Amino acid sequence: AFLTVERMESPIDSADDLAKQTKIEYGAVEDGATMTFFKKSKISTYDKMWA
Amino acid sequence: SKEASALGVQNIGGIFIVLAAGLVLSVFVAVGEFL
């Protein structure tokens, strides 16, 4: 179980892998052209990022 | 996503009871073996 927990998460966590996971915290300037493209322009993983 | 919990006493507690029951049954049947 420990090994599956540590391996199901993506160690390289490239782009879309960050959307599904929630353990790692992430963010940027609030509405500083970062999530302005994410509130609109619905893209699946980008929509998860906006959410 | 938080599941890194070991097999603690809550996870496994009845093993002590079953081993104690086995021990007491073993001695209770061994004392009658001599008779």
UniProtKB/Swiss-Prot annotation, chain A:
The gene is Grik2. Highest expression is found in the olfactory lobe, piriform cortex, dentate gyrus, hippocampus, granular cell layer of the cerebellum, and in caudate-putamen. Sumoylation mediates kainate receptor-mediated endocytosis and regulates synaptic transmission. Sumoylation is enhanced by PIAS3 and desumoylated by SENP1. Ubiquitinated. Ubiquitination regulates the GRIK2 levels at the synapse by leading kainate receptor degradation through proteasome. Homotetramer and heterotetramer with GRIK5. Tetramers may be formed by the dimerization of dimers. Assembles into a kainate-gated homomeric channel that does not bind AMPA. Can form functional heteromeric receptors with GRIK4 and GRIK5. Can form functional heteromeric receptors with GRIK3. Interacts with DLG4. Interacts with NETO2. Interacts (via C-terminus) with KLHL17 (via kelch repeats); the interaction targets GRIK2 for degradation via ubiquitin-proteasome pathway. Belongs to the glutamate-gated ion channel (TC 1.A.10.1) family. GRIK2 subfamily. The postsynaptic actions of Glu are mediated by a variety of receptors that are named according to their selective agonists. This receptor binds domoate > kainate > quisqualate > glutamate. It does not bind AMPA without coexpression with GRIK5. It comes from Rattus norvegicus. This is Glutamate receptor ionotropic, kainate 2. L-glutamate binds at A33, T34. Ionotropic glutamate receptor that functions as a cation-permeable ligand-gated ion channel, gated by L-glutamate and the glutamatergic agonist kainic acid. L-glutamate acts as an excitatory neurotransmitter at many synapses in the central nervous system. Binding of the excitatory neurotransmitter L-glutamate induces a conformation change, leading to the opening of the cation channel, and thereby converts the chemical signal to an electrical impulse. The receptor then desensitizes rapidly and enters a transient inactive state, characterized by the presence of bound agonist. Independent of its ionotropic glutamate receptor activity, acts as a thermoreceptor conferring sensitivity to cold temperatures. Functions in dorsal root ganglion neurons. It is found in: Cell membrane; Postsynaptic cell membrane. It comes from the Eukaryota. The chain holds residues 657 to 707 of 908 of the full protein.
